[model samples]
Every structure is written in C-alpha cells, then in structure tokens.
Target: PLVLIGSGLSSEQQKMLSELAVILKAKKYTEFDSTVTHVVVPGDAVQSTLKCMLGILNGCWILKFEWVKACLRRKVCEQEEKYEIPEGPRRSRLNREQLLPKLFDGCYFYLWGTFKHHPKDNLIKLLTAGGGQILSRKPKPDSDVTQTINTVAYHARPDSDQRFCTQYIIYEDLCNYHPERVRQGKVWKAPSSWFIDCVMSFELLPLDS
Candidate 1:
C-alpha cells in the first residue's frame, strides 16, 4: 500500500511551513519519479482542508514542546530556580493535557491546504498521530497504571522542558530510520528531473477488474 505522510503549522508558523513544504517536495520528488500513492497529511485529510489545517497546528504544538524545553532549561539554569512565568522571552508554561485538542485542531489545517492547493494523482490514505483521541492506552507489565499516559507520566513532569525534550528525542530517533536527504551542514539537493519523470510515467492495471 502507498502511504503519504504530512504535517502543517499555524499562521504564525506559515513561513516555516511554506519553506518546509518546498524542502520536502524538492527532497522527495527529485530524480525518483515520485509515485507516492498515499498523501498522508498531519491528520485525516479525507475530511476537508480545514481539518487538515487544524492538524498541522496541533502537530506543531506537540513539537513545540521540544523548543519549549530548550528555552526553559536555559532560563532555569540562568536563575537556578523552578520554572517561573513572566521572567523572560522564553518563559512558557501550560497545562499540557488540557491543550491537546486545541493543538490537534490547529495542526489539521495543513492537510486541508495540500488537498485544496496541491492535489495529487496518486493520493491515498491520510494518517495523523493525534486527534484528541488516544489510539492505544495500554500500560507496562510492571506498572500499576492501565493507561499509556499514566505510564509515561511516571517519568515526566507534564508541561516541563524535560518531558518535551524526551518526546522530541524519541521522534528524532524514529525519523532516523529513513534515508535522510538533507543532513546537518549540508545544502538541500534535488534529484535529476528525468529520473523523477520516469517514475511518474508508470501505468498499472486494476486489481479487481
């Protein structure tokens, strides 16, 4: 099965999203005849553009926690105290669990933008990691908790920089499984156009016919 994974961001983050989209398209479509049969946005793009847009914003919220941690750690060490509000440009504290739905909704916009703005021929399934609904909530064998959040909470301080960084590291590790086109200190490169066109020109027969 073909799979297309994507994500979006908020208006405040629109510039980042645009730049990222170009980078992604350039990297993925170069010299390989992009035959991506699935166009997976940050959420269920099967619904509408609005939903997709919301997904991007929401997805970023989850991601921003990482930056937040980095920001907070620097602040904490500078003052040697627990995290405090109104201290500096980096001060940020929120009830992490309470913001899940809002973040998910905002991140959905990107999926919508792709569908309405950049429709593709081979688009298929749309998948998102968050939508205000926990897909699996199982607990560890030795833990007393029966829910996934509870299990993870044992090791984290909700809304803290450490928690955010831990999650960020996990995601970073997961992305490493792929052959990265752009690595640190390297300029983005595009594959030869001829190679990509060749892959895009394929014809296939229907299975049920």
Candidate 2:
C-alpha cells in the first residue's frame, strides 16, 4: 500500500517525504512511479487531495509526515520487504518507544536556517528517536539560554538577530559560507558531518573544527 502526505509541512519536510518515497520505490513497495510518489496536499485543499489520492490509489493510506518518518526508520533498521501502515484516525500518534535513546540521548539541539542534507522533519525524527530534545525555535534572549541549550545546528548564517546562544555551531564545511556573521566570540564552529556521523554511529562524535 502507498502513503500520502497531508498539508502543513515545511519545504524541508516535503523533501524528507520525497526521499522516503524514493527509498520505498526502490524497494518496490509503492504502486506509483518514483517521480509520482511522495504527493503533498495543498494548504487550502487537503481534503481534496486526500480524496483524489484515495480514489486513484484505491484508498491508500493517508499519513502524517511523522508517521512516514517512523516507517522509514523501521524499514532501515529492520530491512523490511514492505511498509506496514496502521489504520486509525488520521492524526493518531504511533508508538516510537523502541527507537528512542539510540543516538541523541540527553542532547538538546536548536536548528536554524535551511539544511542541505538534513531536512527539518527528518532531523526532528532522528533526534526524537535518539532521546533528544528538538526546540521549536531558538531560545528567547531573556530566556536561560545556556542552562537548557546544548548545541545549535545551522546551515546558512541568517540575519544577525537570529544568532543562537549555544557553545558550538555545526556548519560541516567553512568553505561554503562566511562564518564571521554567525560565529560568536566564545562559540566553537564544527563540521556538520559530526552530527550526521553521530547519528549513523549511534554515538555522539566529537566536533571537527
């Protein structure tokens, strides 16, 4: 059975969904072609898109982006032949208890800007599965920034105002962008591969300057 993504996903979320669709297509789990899968509902016409997908695919599973992430992780870890989508209300939460604390346990990350390899939705799922905290936004200036935040992962340096209050910045490569704007006096800059490697290794890897 195929799956369709509902509305309210950011651009990064859409990309992650597309990547998962590609993986499933490669495994021959989806009926649609790779280019045609990973369909997203329009913001104003979610029900319409859902109806259309159901009608066309003979009532395929309509899932949230979070569920898709879970399914992808399951497939990767278990080497499953096909995706098994659960039936229930559209907004129901799936149990992820078995997956947590594998990589990011006890870490708190604040994500900023657009990432090249790691999409926001996929990042959140990875962190959550590893027992990490994903902040919705950077901590307020008046908030206790140091006590709660452990790391700040940013792709492109945004305007000066969006600067984070963490000790390290994960940029992966200094050659891609200017760091002067994003680098604070005390904060250390590390390669983005540190994060990716850590996730893959299931252990926190040290930062590479």
Candidate 3:
C-alpha cells in the first residue's frame, strides 16, 4: 500500500502519478485490507494530509513525487529500464597504504595561528582523511587546549604555550618569518611540501633540515 501526501503536484508529477495509478490498480497488494492501495491529495493541505495518513492509514508506504517518475520510467518504457533510488554523496574510502602509522591512529590534531588559514581547508581534509581528528578551540581561556590533543600543526610562533601530554609540533613557515620562539619545543620545522608529500606517499617523510 502507498500514500502520497504533498502540497501540490506539477503537470509532470500528475502525469507520472496517473501512470503509477494504472500500474498499482493492475496489481493486487495484499499487505493491507483494502483493494485501493494509493490515496492522493490534490490540494495544498500538506500537514493535514500527513496527520490523517499517520493517524488513520498507518503502515502504508509514503512515497515522494520523484518515486512516481522513477516507477513510470521503469514500468512504461519499451526498453524495460530498471528504477533505482539515486545514492547520496559519500567520502571516498582510503586504502591501507593511504592510512597513517598505527601509533598515530585516532590522534587529535590542533591547528594554530597562521596555519589555520595558510593552506586552510585542503590541509584539514588531508588530516582527517589520514585518520587524525581536528580539535576545535573552546570559547573560554585556558580551556582552548586539551590534554587529548596529540599534535599541533602551526606556521608561526604562537603567542601562548601549546602543551599536551605527548605533543609533536609540525611547523611549516610559509611566510618565512623564522621566529626563534617556534623552535623552543619539540618541533619539526619543514616546508609546506613535506606535509603534502607525506599524505600522498602514505608514510611520514623525514623533517627537512
């Protein structure tokens, strides 16, 4: 059984519905008690239709306008086309060779200062794709950095201390500022290309001299 509840149908939608009605009428749907399998509303009262369908005609299949078109294309065509629901967008799966080291699995990465906007979105995507979690700053002071954050990817010397339990700093000085404070901690100051190359090669490249 099928119930179609919509605001109003366009001319094309109506035509599709008419074809679907013929197809449904020809078959005997034994799921429910009634021979009338489809109930369609020709008016703009959408909420009322939905309420009545849910409250009264429960368990009937509620269909969208696109479904009617899909059914007609499959049923009416001389070529006997197959009707399939279009799939939603999905992130591409990374192979084993594209994954990071087992030690870095599910690690948190915090982006600081100039690195946030230098190469921005693409770098973040790469980090996530490589099994790293991106950490967001908190609205309150001192609460911005957390202990679970395992790495800091920066492009310049941060004004405040960025300390974690076991932190590793990956620095890329794109502006060539070469500030002295950036090297005070365990830092790997390399060219921006190193990060990109490491992601592409699926292995951590050695830090540039």
**Could you say which candidate leads in TM-score?**
2
Q: How many clashes in each structure?
A: 27, 2, 0
Ranking by lDDT: 2, 3, 1
How would you encode candidate 1's per-residue C-alpha lDDT over 1-209 as one tens digit per residue? 22122334344343333333344342221111123211222321222332332223222121222222333444321221222211111111132223423222111111111223223221211213222222232223233422122222122245432222211100112122332532111111112221122112211111112
What CA RMSD would you report for each candidate?
22.1, 14.9, 17.1
Off by over 4 Å in 1: 1-96, 99-116, 120-209
lDDT of each structure? 0.23, 0.42, 0.38
**Of 1 and 3, which scores higher on lDDT?**
3
Error of 3 at 181 (Å): 7.5
How does candidate 2 score on lDDT? Answer: 0.42
Off by over 4 Å in 3: 1-107, 115-118, 137-172, 179-191
What would you estimate as the lDDT of candidate 1?
0.23
List the candidate numbers ranked by TM-score, top first.
Answer: 2, 3, 1
Candidate 2 per-residue C-alpha lDDT over 1-209 given as tens digits, one digit per residue, 9 for 90 to 100: 44444345677766666677667653312233322323333332223222322211222333445555665677652222123233321211121223222334445566656676655565555455445576554544345664555443332123331224334444535347545544444344445555555433333444322
Question: Against the hidden reference, what TM-scores do the models get?
Answer: 0.16, 0.36, 0.33
